[PDB]
Amino acid sequence: VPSWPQILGRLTDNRDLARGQAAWAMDQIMTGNARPAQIAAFAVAMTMKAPTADEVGELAGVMLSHAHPLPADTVPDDAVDVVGTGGDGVNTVNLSTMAAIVVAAAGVPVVKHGNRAASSLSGGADTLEALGVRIDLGPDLVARSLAEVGIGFCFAPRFHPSYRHAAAVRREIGVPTVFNLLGPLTNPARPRAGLIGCAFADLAEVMAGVFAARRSSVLVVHGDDGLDELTTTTTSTIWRVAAGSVDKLTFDPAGFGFARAQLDQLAGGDAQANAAAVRAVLGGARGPVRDAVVLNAAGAIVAHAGLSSRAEWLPAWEEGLRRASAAIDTGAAEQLLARWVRFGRQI
Amino acid sequence: VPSWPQILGRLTDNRDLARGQAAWAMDQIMTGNARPAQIAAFAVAMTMKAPTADEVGELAGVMLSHAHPLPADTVPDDAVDVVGTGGDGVNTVNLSTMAAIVVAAAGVPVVKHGNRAASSLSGGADTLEALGVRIDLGPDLVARSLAEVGIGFCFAPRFHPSYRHAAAVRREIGVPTVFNLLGPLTNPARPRAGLIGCAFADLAEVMAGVFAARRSSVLVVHGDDGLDELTTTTTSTIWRVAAGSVDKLTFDPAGFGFARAQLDQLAGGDAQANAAAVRAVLGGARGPVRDAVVLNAAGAIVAHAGLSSRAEWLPAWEEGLRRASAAIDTGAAEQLLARWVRFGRQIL
Ligand SMILES: O=P(O)(O)OC[C@H]1O[C@H](OP(=O)(O)OP(=O)(O)O)[C@H](O)[C@@H]1O
Numbered sequence: 093v094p095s096w097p098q099i100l101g102r103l104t105d106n107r108d109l110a111r112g113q114a115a116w117a118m119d120q121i122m123t124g125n126a127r128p129a130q131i132a133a134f135a136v137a138m139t140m141k142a143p144t145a146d147e148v149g150e151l152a153g154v155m156l157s158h159a160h161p162l163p164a165d166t167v168p169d170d171a172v173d174v175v176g177t178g179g180d181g182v183n184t185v186n187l188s189t190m191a192a193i194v195v196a197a198a199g200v201p202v203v204k205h206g207n208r209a210a211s212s213l214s215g216g217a218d219t220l221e222a223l224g225v226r227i228d229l230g231p232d233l234v235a236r237s238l239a240e241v242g243i244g245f246c247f248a249p250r251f252h253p254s255y256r257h258a259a260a261v262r263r264e265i266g267v268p269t270v271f272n273l274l275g276p277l278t279n280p281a282r283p284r285a286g287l288i289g290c291a292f293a294d295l296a297e298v299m300a301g302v303f304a305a306r307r308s309s310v311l312v313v314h315g316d317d318g319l320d321e322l323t324t325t326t327t328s329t330i331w332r333v334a335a336g337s338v339d340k341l342t343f344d345p346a347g348f349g350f351a352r353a354q355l356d357q358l359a360g361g362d363a364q365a366n367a368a369a370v371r372a373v374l375g376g377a378r379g380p381v382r383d384a385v386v387l388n389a390a391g392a393i394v395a396h397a398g399l400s401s402r403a404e405w406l407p408a409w410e411e412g413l414r415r416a417s418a419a420i421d422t423g424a425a426e427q428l429l430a431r432w433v434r435f436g437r438q439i
Numbered sequence: 440v441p442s443w444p445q446i447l448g449r450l451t452d453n454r455d456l457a458r459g460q461a462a463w464a465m466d467q468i469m470t471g472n473a474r475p476a477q478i479a480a481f482a483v484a485m486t487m488k489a490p491t492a493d494e495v496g497e498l499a500g501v502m503l504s505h506a507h508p509l510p511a512d513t514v515p516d517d518a519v520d521v522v523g524t525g526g527d528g529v530n531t532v533n534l535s536t537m538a539a540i541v542v543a544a545a546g547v548p549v550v551k552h553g554n555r556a557a558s559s560l561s562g563g564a565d566t567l568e569a570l571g572v573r574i575d576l577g578p579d580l581v582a583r584s585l586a587e588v589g590i591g592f593c594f595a596p597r598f599h600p601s602y603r604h605a606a607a608v609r610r611e612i613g614v615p616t617v618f619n620l621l622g623p624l625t626n627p628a629r630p631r632a633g634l635i636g637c638a639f640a641d642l643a644e645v646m647a648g649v650f651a652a653r654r655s656s657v658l659v660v661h662g663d664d665g666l667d668e669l670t671t672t673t674t675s676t677i678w679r680v681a682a683g684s685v686d687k688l689t690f691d692p693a694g695f696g697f698a699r700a701q702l703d704q705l706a707g708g709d710a711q712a713n714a715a716a717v718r719a720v721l722g723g724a725r726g727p728v729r730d731a732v733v734l735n736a737a738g739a740i741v742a743h744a745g746l747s748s749r750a751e752w753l754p755a756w757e758e759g760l761r762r763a764s765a766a767i768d769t770g771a772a773e774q775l776l777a778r779w780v781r782f783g784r785q786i787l
Pocket residue numbers: 174175176177178179180181185186187188189190205206207208209210211212213214215216217275289
């Protein structure tokens with residue numbers, strides 16, 4: 093007999109929910125049946141209790157049930173995502189978006205989920221738009237983009253219209269909640285591999301748990317400097333997910349010869365400034381931003397290699413770094429972005 | 440510059456707020472500038488972080504600044520309230536309301552803050568209405584009632600119209616929050632003494648701290664059976680507020696000769712049934728309901744005595760118990776209710 097008083101009371105008592113209660117709540121939210129006060133109370137209470145992977149799995153699974161899917165047999169079995177929670181508070185260039193282009197240029201199919209800025213100056217979607225990429229395509233044209241260009245972009249508001257009540261509440265209250273975890277967990281193309289950034293150190297493990305219950309090869313990553321990306325300024329924590337299990341480890345890019353960078357060297361600006369940074373990297377400019385892009389692209393290539401799991405961790409990294417660099421140095425990435433822009437103009 | 444993201448982020452980080460932040464939030468809420476989502480997020484976050492006396496003091500002070508006051512010089516310096524949070528989830532007769540009548544009949548001015556039921560079958564206000572008492576009077580008439588009858592009732596929605604945004608959110612989410620503490624702390628007549636029940640054991644101390652900052656003479660009470668009243672079924676915890684400090688006590692009514700009652704002996708029903716229980720007690724019927732009323736009335740009289748605090752605890756209780764018993768057995772309590780009903784009927 094589920095209800096808001098029952099579910100909110102359990103959370104405010106600091107108890108995990110019974111199985112199915114988070115799903116009930118999320119379905120009320122997604123069908124327009126929850127009052128904004130109830131949505132907010134639920135989001136905050138779940139956040140302060142500390143959500144479990146089972147609970148977040150219910151939230152994401154319900155949200156996916158209401159999403160627009162891509163057409164049958166249009167997403168390759170080995171498609172990868174590169175996306176994070178955001179909310180790291182650091183205002184960087186768009187590392188995930190740049191890595192995604194590089195990964196696609198390396199020959200790995202990419203279906204990227206993304207959205208505009210929430211609290212940074214330019215989000216991945218804003219920057220793609222400033223580059224001339226069409227961010228607003230429906231299921232059929234995202235599938236065509238993927239088939240014709242090797243990359244597609246699923247704009248969250250276009251694919252998750254029923255999330256609008258939750259989204260408005262998120263904007264009204266501003267504070268990060270458990271809802272900030274859901275974007276990376278609800279890519280409507282349901283790719284089985286991903287490099288997934290988490291700004292919230294204590295929730296990365298929960299996100300990894302969600303992925304472990306799916307048929308997935310994922311690196312969930314948190315930079316020990318706070319970034320929702322693999323960082324070049326220090327070590328990162330990685331939760332490797334494969335075969336239904338998790339392997340937590342400390343990762344140090346100095347092992348691959350990367351110089352230690354400063355956070356300010358990765359600083360971004362508005363959409364035009366961040367778009368310029370994309371073009372600079374794809375044109376071969378050497379430096380800290382490139383290094384961070386190559387590191388993250390390699391990470392996504394390692395996640396992808398985990399699907400057809402021949403190679404071991406270290407060799408997979410060495411190959412990922414070689415492929416990511418070559419994709420830039422040979423012009424493939426610059427060429428792939430141009431092709432993606434062309435595709436959107438030819439629609 | 441205070442803001443929702445700032446304030447809510449601090450609470451979700453499990454930090455106490457900076458001075459002024461809770462006041463800002465409450466002023467947004469009281470002016471209609473807070474979205475329902477913001478109100479709910481704040482109420483829940485403040486609850487799960489665990490509110491401090493300073494924070495609740497800010498909420499209550501802002502709320503009072505928006506309330507209708509009584510007219511100047513109409514509330515005696517020694518007026519008392521008898522009121523609790525409710526939310527104990529035990530169906531009982533209206534113990535605070537009955538005690539309030541008995542206290543007034545003992546010659547202690549009572550200005551009661553109250554409201555309808557939120558969870559229970561009949562709240563104080565509902566039962567008073569069933570007895571024929573006019574509960575919906577403005578400031579001038581509550582003042583007149585206090586003067587002519589010895590008791591007045593401030594009906595919370597009449598005195599706190601700007602709380603309507605918060606009250607709506609409270610109903611929508613159902614779960615108890617820090618807002619459930621505010622009733623007893625926002626009596627618009629500002630009596631300086633009271634017997635204040637708290638259903639939430641871990642928050643009684645916080646409520647006591649707010650009264651300590653006001654230098655009120657107050658007993659904040661929680662029955663160890665969960666009641667937001669002094670109980671007769673077992674011991675109670677009392678946070679005694681005197682001279683601006685709080686000390687915590689275990690109270691056992693057995694020491695005053697009270698037999699242990701069972702919770703079902705205090706069971707209530709709808710407004711008509713609880714009105715009958717009131718009439719039975721005031722007519723002098725013995726038994727567990729009278730015992731509980733007498734105990735709580737004495738507690739309020741003890742709090743009142745603490746305003747002139749040469750207050751040896753056990754003798755204060757002994758005199759309080761005697762005064763409450765006499766107020767019933769002389770007929771004064773039954774007579775006072777009749778006077779109160781008469782006053783309301785004269786208004787037309
Ligand atoms: O404004 P914030 O909350 O900090 O978030 C900044 C971006 O991070 C996330 O995207 P993603 O990882 O796809 O993009 P990026 O790493 O390329 O910016 C999010 O969807 C935003 O677009």
